[PDB]
Amino acid sequence: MHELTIYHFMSDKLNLYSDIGNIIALRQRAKKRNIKVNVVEINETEGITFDECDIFFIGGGSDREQALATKELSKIKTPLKEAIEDGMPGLTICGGYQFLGKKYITPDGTELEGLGILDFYTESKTNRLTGDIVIESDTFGTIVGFENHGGRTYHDFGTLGHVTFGYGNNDEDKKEGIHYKNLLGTYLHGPILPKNYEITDYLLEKACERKGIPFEPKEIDNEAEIQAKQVLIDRANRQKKSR
Ligand SMILES: NC(=O)CC[C@H](N)C(=O)O
C-alpha cells in the first residue's frame, strides 16, 4: 500500500502529441501493484523542485506550442538536468523529446532553441518518416507504434532499440528514440504507445527502486496488450520493406 508522485509538464500547451494516455496507463499498471499515483499538473515552473518527484512526463506540441513550453521549462533547466543526471525516470514524446536537445531546425533552416539538457540536435525535412514501426529492444522487448515525423534526430546516447520495420530517429540509423540513464524519449505517440507496457513498468520499477518501495506483483496479466501489439507486428511483417 504505497504511493508515487508524477510531474506532468505543460499538458495545457502540448496538445498535438499528448502524454495523457501514458499517464493513464501508468496509473492503471501502478494500481495493479497496489500503488496510488499522485499527478502534479505543472504549467508554470517557478519554484518547482524535484525532491518529491518520482517520474516526469513531457508531451509534444506544434512548433509554436513546444517553443512556449520550452521557454517555461528553461526556468528550471538546471534542477531538471540535475534530476535527470541523478537517475530520475521520465518519458518524453516527439517535441518533448526533441527539445531536450540543443536545437530544433525547421525545413527552411530556422533554428529553435531547445532546453539544451543533452547535447544533440534535430533537423526537419518536409518529407516525413511515416508508417508502422517495430523495434527490438534489449530492455523493453518488442516496441510497436506509428511514426510520422519530419524531424531527423542525431544523438550519440542510448536508444530504445533497433528498428526492424520503419525508420526511427532518422533515415539511416534504424534506431528509435533516446534512453539516457532513466530518461526515455520517442517519436511514438497516441493510443498505441501505452500498449507497450514494458515502458510503463520500467518507469514504475525504477521509481520504486529509487524510493524504496516494493513493486509487486512484478508479473501481471498482459494478454490484451500483447494481443494489441501483435496486430501491428503481424501487419508490419506483411508489408513492403521501408526504404
Ligand atoms: N499531424 C500533424 O503533424 C499535424 C496536423 C497535420 N500536419 C495536418 O496536416 O493535418
Author numbering: 1 to 243
Paper text:
Moreover, in vitro experiments showed that the MurT-GatD complex catalyzes glutamate amidation of lipid II using L-glutamine as a direct amine donor, when ATP and Mg2+ were present.
The crystal structure was solved at 1.85 Å resolution, unraveling singular features of GATase architecture and important residues at the active site. The S. aureus GatD structure here reported was crystallized without its synthase domain (MurT), consequently, in an unproductive enzymatic form. Interestingly, GatD holds an extra 17 residues long α-helix (α7) at the C-terminal that is absent in all GATases characterized so far. In the structure here reported, glutamate is replaced by a glycine (G190), thereby eliminating any possible polarization effect upon the catalytic histidine H189. The amino acid molecule is found at the surface of the protein, at 8.6 Å from the nucleophilic thiol group of C94, only interacting with R128 from molecule A. The amide oxygen of the free glutamine is establishing hydrogen bonds with the guanidinium group of R128, with bond distances of 3.3 Å and 2.7 Å. The GatD-glutamine complex here reported shows the Y17 side chain nearly co-planar to the H189 imidazole ring and establishing a hydrophobic interaction with C94. In this conformation, Y17 is obstructing the access of the free glutamine to the active site.
